Design a protein around this ligand. Structure first.
Ligand SMILES: O=C(Nc1cccc(-c2nnn[nH]2)c1)c1ccc2[nH]cc(Br)c2c1
Ligand SMILES: O=C(Nc1cccc(-c2nnn[nH]2)c1)c1ccc2[nH]cc(Br)c2c1
Ligand SMILES: O=C(Nc1cccc(-c2nnn[nH]2)c1)c1ccc2[nH]cc(Br)c2c1
Ligand SMILES: O=C(Nc1cccc(-c2nnn[nH]2)c1)c1ccc2[nH]cc(Br)c2c1
Lengths: 256, 257, 257
């Protein structure tokens, strides 16, 4: 299962069932969980934890140091959950002590070829990062978010649950939950109604969220005005609280 | 020896005369490689895949991987590559899907530059140039002599017409007619590839007729049906204009405007 | 030992005594590596290439390949890289073409991040940062301390001035004067890199003179030649203004506006 042309550092820790292809490097302090398949020509560096039933494709560099000059070799980590697919040539950097010293990925994420997950980024669950998507650093991607091909995300930006970025988008401000954004610079267009139907949202939840978008984007309310107007919608629908919570946590302004 | 002993050749792989395979390359099951093809070092070939003659594939390329667009792959789905193609460093080419074509198809004399992506069920003709990090999302048709400049992004099902040209960083969401130049995100028509026509040995007559054809379609408020009617006479005189007319006719989902 | 036994070292290669080469790396014929340099695993070095001292080259980089540019027909051309450079994952650097000076040149203390592309005949100075997926198409000159943010695209023959800055996703088709800040596709001139200038310790007087010089070129309706003639005075007083003036005077592709 561990190909004999692979290099497994002695301090690495591999569960039963783990496969490692030829000419891959499982570096010092790299933990891998049961059912995970490392392809050929993968470089893993630690300290890193990889969970269960993950698949990591050739030419990926998972757990290197950020080249960002504000990192100076301090002990920082990367954690990856379960049932993720990391495709060809993905780069994933460990955290920096200036934040939480950890880069974090949840479960059931699909990270397509040549995607870049910068230091200190947090990815939730059931996210899709399409080819060459780049998180510059300290980027938070909530559950079910889809970033289309060559989406560039600026440092510290929050990408909301069920949000969608069009291909070649450049995101400089928080994207609220459910919002669809396009272009360079990114601008809000609508709500991810497909994402909501994928979730089996009641038709009352979807109408509540359709109206919630109007209150924030199409009624000339300021962010403060919107948040108060949404309070009752948010009380009634957990799905609208996700939206309101995402705008409330947007300390530096939302994508318009 | 032409086959480096550090490469992994599957027993079902078929290598023709004068094929070279560099060290640490994988030639997987049902991969066929034609006469005089050079596989670089650190290349992953996955099948079922048919590669023709006098191709060159550079290091860190993943040729014939399954699309990650489906959670559960269909099999068998094919990749077909013709002759005299250059595939540069880190290029990804995905096989077809059982739902659509079941084949990703590349013709002859194409240049696919570093880190370009050719998505499942795409079709590339002959003499095309995909510059660095060009991405064909899926079911993209690129006709003969098209040039896509660096970091050109193409949406699913879009047709890139013969002799067309995309500018650097273009995001293409609708068909590009033959000969048309497009720029920006989202892509906008600007003119025709007059430079390319001259390098192809197009008559000044053909080039003048194609200039007029551009104005008929884009500049004169015609419906497409009206544009097709207005172009019929010029298309019958010039095969070069027929290629333009046919790219407009075949564009069911609209053209880049 | 410092050379991994799984690395390929061409017998013509010249390595200083403390050079490290990781496993499954290639040091090709006529590649020279200076003292203190670390080559990671899975690196492809092709020559004729000279690499200086205390460099670091990461996995999956292709350093010294021929350009795929059709104008290159296999002529003997070179790559020269200086000292204290960092080349991150998957970087591509191509040798020169005889049509220019048969050399691609990189100075010292440069940071070239993952999947950056340095095209044939490019000249990079000292203390430059090319962020992820920056692509220099060919014959691009990047002068000292320039910062090109992520996915910056540079057209052939463009010059990037000293202490200039590009925003993420910039598409530069025209020359960027020294100190100027550009953004967008196509790239737009916004301001000067005042945070760069202050971090580097430029004087308040030089920063004020550069602030006024920006107005002269961009905001007084002067033609390039009229602005150069108006810059004459301040350029004689402040070396920094002369660097600015010179970058406008040396422009081949017009200046980013
Ligand atoms: O972009 C993709 N799908 C998609 C589906 C619906 C709307 C949009 C939309 N609208 N505006 N910009 N992108 C986009 C897509 C899917 C799979 C891919 N694989 C590689 C690439 Br590049 C890619 C791109
Ligand atoms: O739901 C998707 N796209 C979506 C959803 C809502 C509005 C729009 C919209 N609006 N204007 N243009 N595109 C688009 C979707 C689903 C599965 C996918 N797999 C890969 C990709 Br990219 C993707 C995208
Ligand atoms: O940009 C390229 N060619 C080209 C030629 C003529 C007009 C234009 C145009 N005009 N406006 N936007 N792009 C573009 C080009 C050629 C070779 C290359 N190799 C690597 C890269 Br990135 C690259 C880019
Ligand atoms: O672009 C980056 N940083 C940056 C810093 C300051 C201003 C701007 C700016 N402002 N407006 N447009 N771009 C941008 C950056 C830094 C590190 C990275 N690592 C991977 C990627 Br992609 C990346 C991108």
């Amino acid at each position: 299962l561990i190909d004999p042309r692979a290099i497994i550092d002695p301090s690495a820790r591999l569960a039963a069932d783990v496969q490692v292809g030829p000419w891959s490097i499982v570096g010092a302090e790299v933990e891998i969980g049961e059912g995970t398949v490392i392809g050929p020509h993968v470089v893993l560096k630690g300290p890193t934890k990889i969970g269960k039933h993950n698949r990591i494709y050739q030419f990926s560099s998972v757990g290197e140091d950020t080249p960002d000059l504000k990192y100076k070799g301090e002990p920082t980590r990367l954690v990856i959950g379960d049932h993720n697919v990391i495709r060809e040539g993905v780069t994933i950097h460990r955290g920096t002590v200036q934040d939480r010293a950890e880069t974090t990925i949840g479960d059931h994420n699909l990270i397509m070829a040549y995607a870049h997950i910068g230091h200190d980024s947090v990815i939730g669950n059931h996210c899709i990062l399409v080819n060459n998507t780049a998180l510059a650093g300290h980027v938070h991607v909530d559950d079910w978010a889809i970033l289309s091909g060559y989406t560039l995300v600026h440092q510290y930006c929050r990408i909301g649950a069920h949000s969608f970025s069009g291909m070649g988008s450049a995101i400089g401000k928080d994207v609220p939950a459910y919002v669809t954004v396009f272009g360079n610079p990114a601008e809000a267009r609508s709500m991810n109604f497909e994402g909501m139907r994928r979730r089996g949202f009641s038709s009352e939840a979807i109408h509540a969220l359709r109206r919630a978008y109007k209150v924030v984007y199409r009624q000339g309310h300021t962010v403060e005005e919107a948040l108060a107007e949404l309070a009752e919608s948010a009380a009634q629908f957990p799905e609208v609280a996700v939206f309101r919570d995402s705008i409330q946590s947007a300390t530096r302004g939302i994508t318009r």
